[PDB]
């Protein structure tokens, strides 16, 4: 079965550098004509498409971003490997990794992975209305309609979001579990 | 470097219409050019491939074609597993996504019910507001009742009157 | 607006692929630029094989590679700091 995944950090600080890895089973980058490639994506915006690396090694870059990126494949373990230098807070997303469609004259990406989401910030975990990092569980009386969880936005480096209803709270990085 | 423009970010739709996506190339890309699906949370699915081979398992409802620099994808009868964001991509040279287009479902035109606390903008309709330090979050159509919300005296202004409901 | 050349031709006796295309006089010296991309197996960017110059001929031995690939051309015309459109050239495959 034809596989990808993406590891990441998760949570990286500016300036530093970015270690993306995307593992996968089910086909060989050493046959003739494979390929496999990066694209990320920010909240409620499109797609972008950051490098590519074929089964000879010869790599791909946009053009953009090729000054901080490179791009490495191995194997003898199966990954493809993705680097990221001077790391900026509009890097934050997430990303993929997804391989070419094996057949001639097609280069559509038919196999992708999940996803990783990096999150690029200077914080720390901080523990109806609501701290670092997302996510966050804003439950009511323990469980349905009529309830408006909203989107985090961030203020000073810090999410904030609100619940309404016509409240559980939780918090996983910091096991803040306020039962209101 | 070539460019795709897809417009608009958003088209308002009812369930059972046809639905064609405008995906406009700058040179042209000699029918390479690939359809993607994506719903909230999840990886895009790629749909079709060279402009017009559907990939396996996707339904027969949908479409593509075009050529030189114009491509659009179709759906003949909208269903709610069809209701995603659309981005077409251009794979001639290297690759480039377009902006996407991501299908609304329309619905009559509801009054937000404001509730302030010492300010909530619930379930309305048409999506467009404007409010009058302070920090706002918007939520998805609802799939129970199309309708929106958005987190913020209070005031707005929406279409549904002209008075703006101050609270 | 300046003028588009024509009858973009590719040639090639042996591996030695040269491009020929044809323009029209001017009283200034038109320059040309051409390009070849590969695709097939790879899909690279457009890369420039003759950059400004005023021969209606352009070879570009050291841009094939890979005979599983198809290469395709595309040449436009300069006269002063003005451009011309691009004329693009149909498919290349075997010698």
Same mark, same amino acid.
């Not at chain 1, 070419?100 to 038919?110: E, K, L």
């Not at chain 1, 961030?154 to 209101?180: E, F, G």
């Not at chain 2, 470097?1 to 059972?16: A, D, I, K, R």
């Given at each position: 079965?034809?596989?990808?995944?993406?590891?990441?950090?998760?949570?990286?600080?500016?300036?530093?550098?970015?270690?993306?890895?995307?593992?996968?089973?089910?086909?060989?980058? /050493?046959?003739?004509?494979?390929?496999?490639?990066?694209?990320?994506?920010?909240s409620?915006?499109?797609?972008?498409?950051?490098?590519?690396?074929?089964?000879?090694?010869?790599?791909?870059?946009?053009?953009?971003?090729?000054?901080?990126?490179?791009?490495?494949?191995?194997?003898?373990?199966?990954?493809?490997?993705?680097?990221?230098?001077?790391?900026?807070?509009?890097?934050?997303?997430?990303?993929?990794?997804?391989?070419?469609?094996?057949?001639?004259?097609?280069?559509?990406?038919?196999?992708?992975?999940?996803?990783?989401?990096?999150?690029?910030?200077?914080?720390?975990?901080?523990?109806?209305?609501?701290?670092?990092?997302?996510?966050?569980?804003? /439950?009511?009386?323990?469980?349905?309609?009529?309830?408006?969880?909203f989107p985090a936005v961030l203020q000073?480096?810090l999410y904030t979001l609100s619940?309404?209803?016509?409240?559980?709270?939780?918090?996983?990085?910091?096991?803040?579990?306020?039962?209101? | 470097?070539?460019?795709?423009?897809?417009?608009?970010?958003?088209?308002?739709?009812?369930?059972?219409?046809?639905?064609?996506?405008?995906?406009?190339?700058?040179?042209?890309?000699?029918?390479?050019?690939?359809?993607?699906?994506?719903?909230?949370?999840?990886?895009?699915?790629?749909?079709?491939?060279?402009?017009?081979?559907?990939?396996?398992?996707?339904?027969?409802?949908?479409?593509?074609?075009?050529?030189?620099?114009?491509?659009?994808?179709?759906?003949?009868?909208?269903?709610?597993?069809?209701?995603?964001?659309?981005?077409?991509?251009?794979?001639?040279?290297?690759?480039?996504?377009?902006?996407?287009?991501?299908?609304?479902?329309?619905?009559?035109?509801?009054?937000?019910?404001?509730?302030?606390?010492?300010?909530?903008?619930?379930?309305?309709?048409?999506?467009?507001?404007?409010?009058?330090?302070v920090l706002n979050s918007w939520?998805?159509?609802?799939?129970?009742?199309?309708?929106?919300?958005?987190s913020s005296?209070?005031?707005?202004?929406?279409?549904?009157?002209?008075?703006?409901?101050?609270? | 607006?300046?003028?588009?050349?024509?009858?973009?031709?590719?040639?090639?006796?042996?591996?030695?692929?040269?491009?020929?295309?044809?323009?029209?006089?001017?009283?200034?010296?038109?320059?040309?630029?051409?390009?070849?991309?590969?695709?097939?197996?790879?899909? +690279?960017?457009?890369? !420039?094989?003759?950059?400004?110059?005023?021969?209606?001929?352009?070879?570009?031995? !050291?841009?094939?590679? !890979?005979?599983?690939?198809?290469?395709?051309?595309?040449?436009?015309?300069?006269?002063?700091?003005?451009?011309?459109?691009?004329?693009?050239?149909?498919?290349?495959?075997? +010698?």
């Amino acid at each position: 079965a034809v596989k990808l995944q993406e590891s990441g950090p998760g949570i990286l600080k500016p300036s530093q550098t970015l270690s993306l890895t995307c593992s996968f089973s089910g086909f060989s980058l /050493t046959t003739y004509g494979m390929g496999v490639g990066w694209i990320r994506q920010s909240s409620g915006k499109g797609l972008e498409w950051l490098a590519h690396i074929w089964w000879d090694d010869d790599k791909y870059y946009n053009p953009s971003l090729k000054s901080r990126l490179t791009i490495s494949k191995d194997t003898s373990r199966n990954q493809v490997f993705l680097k990221i230098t001077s790391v900026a807070t509009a890097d934050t997303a997430t990303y993929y990794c997804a391989r070419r469609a094996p057949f001639y004259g097609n280069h559509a990406m038919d196999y992708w992975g999940q996803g990783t989401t990096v999150t690029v910030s200077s914080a720390k975990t901080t523990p109806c209305l609501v701290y670092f990092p997302e996510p966050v569980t804003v /439950t009511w009386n323990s469980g349905s309609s009529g309830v408006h969880t909203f989107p985090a936005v961030l203020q000073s480096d810090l999410y904030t979001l609100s619940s309404s209803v016509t409240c559980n709270v939780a918090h996983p990085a910091s096991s803040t579990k306020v039962d209101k | 470097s070539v460019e795709m423009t897809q417009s608009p970010s958003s088209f308002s739709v009812s369930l059972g219409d046809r639905v064609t996506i405008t995906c406009k190339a700058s040179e042209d890309i000699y029918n390479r050019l690939a359809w993607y699906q994506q719903k909230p949370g999840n990886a895009p699915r790629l749909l079709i491939s060279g402009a017009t081979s559907l990939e396996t398992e996707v339904p027969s409802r949908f479409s593509g074609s075009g050529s030189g620099k114009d491509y659009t994808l179709s759906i003949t009868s909208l269903q709610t597993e069809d209701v995603a964001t659309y981005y077409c991509q251009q794979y001639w040279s290297t690759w480039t996504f377009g902006g996407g287009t991501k299908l609304e479902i329309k619905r009559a035109d509801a009054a937000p019910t404001v509730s302030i606390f010492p300010c909530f903008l619930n379930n309305f309709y048409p999506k467009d507001i404007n409010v009058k330090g302070v920090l706002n979050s918007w939520t998805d159509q609802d799939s129970k009742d199309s309708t929106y919300s958005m987190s913020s005296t209070c005031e707005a202004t929406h279409k549904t009157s002209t008075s703006p409901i101050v609270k | 607006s300046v003028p588009t050349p024509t009858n973009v031709t590719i040639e090639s006796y042996n591996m030695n692929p040269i491009v020929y295309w044809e323009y029209q006089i001017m009283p200034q010296v038109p320059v040309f630029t051409v390009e070849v991309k590969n695709y097939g197996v790879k899909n +690279s960017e457009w890369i !420039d094989a003759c950059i400004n110059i005023s021969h209606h001929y352009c070879n570009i031995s !050291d841009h094939v590679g !890979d005979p599983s690939n198809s290469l395709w051309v595309r040449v436009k015309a300069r006269v002063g700091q003005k451009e011309s459109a691009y004329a693009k050239s149909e498919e290349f495959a075997v +010698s």
